Amino acid sequence: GWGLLFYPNNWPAIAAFHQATEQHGQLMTLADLIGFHFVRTSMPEYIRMVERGTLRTFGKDVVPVAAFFSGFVSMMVYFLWWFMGRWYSTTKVIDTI
Partner 1 sequence: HGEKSQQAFLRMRTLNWYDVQWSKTTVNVNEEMVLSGKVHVFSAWPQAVANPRVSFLNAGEPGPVLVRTAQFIGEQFAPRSVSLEIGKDYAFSINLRGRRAGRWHVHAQINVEGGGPIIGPGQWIEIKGDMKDFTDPVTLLDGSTVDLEHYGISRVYAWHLPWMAVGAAWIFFWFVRKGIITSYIRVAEGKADDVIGDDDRRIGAIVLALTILATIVGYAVTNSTFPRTIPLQAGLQKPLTPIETEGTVGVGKENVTTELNGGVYKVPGRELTINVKVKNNTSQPLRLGEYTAAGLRFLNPDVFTTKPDFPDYLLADRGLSVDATPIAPGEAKEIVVKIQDARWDIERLSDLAYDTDSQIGGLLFFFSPDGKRYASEIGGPVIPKFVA
Q: Which residues bind partner 1 (CB under 8 A)?
A: 5, 8-9, 11-13, 15-34, 36-39, 41-42, 44-46, 48, 50-60
Q: What does the DSSP 8-state code read for residue 17?
A: G
Quick one: 7 or 74, whose CB is closer to partner 1? Answer: 7
Measured CA to CA, the distance from residue 52 to residue 78 in angstroms comes to 30
Min separation Cβ 6 and partner 1, Å: 11
Of 27, 33, 35, 29, nearest to 16 by C-alpha is 29
CB of 77 to partner 1, least distance (A): 21
